[PDB]
Write a structure and sequence with these properties.
2 copies of one chain form a homodimer. By secondary structure, chain A is an alpha+beta fold. Chain A has one domain: Arc Repressor Mutant, subunit A (Orthogonal Bundle). In chain A, 31% of the residues lie in helices and 15% in strands. In chain A, strands 1-2-4-3 form a 4-stranded antiparallel sheet, with helices on one face. In chain A, strand 1 and strand 2 form a beta hairpin. The first copy, chain A, is globular, with a radius of gyration of 13 Å. Chain A binds a DNA duplex through helix 4. Chains A, B: Belongs to the HSF family. Chains A, B: It is found in: Nucleus; Cytoplasm; Nucleus, Nucleoplasm; Cytoplasm, Perinuclear region. Chains A, B: This is Heat shock factor protein 1. Chains A, B: It comes from Homo sapiens.
DNA sequence: GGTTCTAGAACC
DNA sequence: GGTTCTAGAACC
């Protein structure tokens, strides 16, 4: 396949029991969460990407069409969502498209 | 004076010995640094602002014309700068202007 | 106005 | 293309 390396890395990042303490799939599998935003940034992002910044990780998620899921009004949790980014459906990452 | 509350809060945030471990003036006084970005976010921002997010703190700094100082190529440090935001010159915060 | 979310554009 | 920096616009 010729899927972008961001998405195969995201898939791996999320899909990793050892990682699940800081970023894991939602129990249904239609979204993924990230806890302790700043530790994840510091302790996980560099092992997959060429930086250590949540800001820059998020920027990609937006560029590939992901949208944050809003938690409405403590709870240091950030969740993201894309229709073709589903736990049972790895072959759907091919269908994701970065906007250029 | 009728200076915006963001800037009086920034001034206080930076200018506080107890805070200086996570955000302090540059030794000359022409800029301010922030260390351990994520802890500052979590442990300081909420005591001055209605959130706990660096992203949203930065956004204001940009809105009031601050510009990040680039550290060029480990070093978990972020520095910001504004010509009318100087340690000896509190009365110059009146001269700062948010773009609208 | 402050906060949050997303995106533009420059620099790699 | 990925990263960084800043800003637009909607929602409060």
């Amino acid at each position: 396949s010729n899927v972008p390396a961001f998405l195969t890395k995201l898939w791996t990042l999320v899909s990793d029991p050892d990682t699940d303490a800081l970023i894991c799939w939602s129990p249904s599998g239609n979204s993924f969460h990230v806890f302790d935003q700043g530790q994840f940034a510091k302790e996980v992002l560099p092992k997959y990407f060429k930086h250590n910044n949540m800001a820059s990780f998020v920027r990609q998620l937006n560029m590939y069409g992901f949208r944050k899921v809003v938690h409405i009004e403590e709870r240091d949790d950030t969740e993201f969502q894309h229709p073709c980014f589903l736990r049972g459906q790895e072959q759907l990452l091919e269908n994701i498209k970065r906007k250029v």
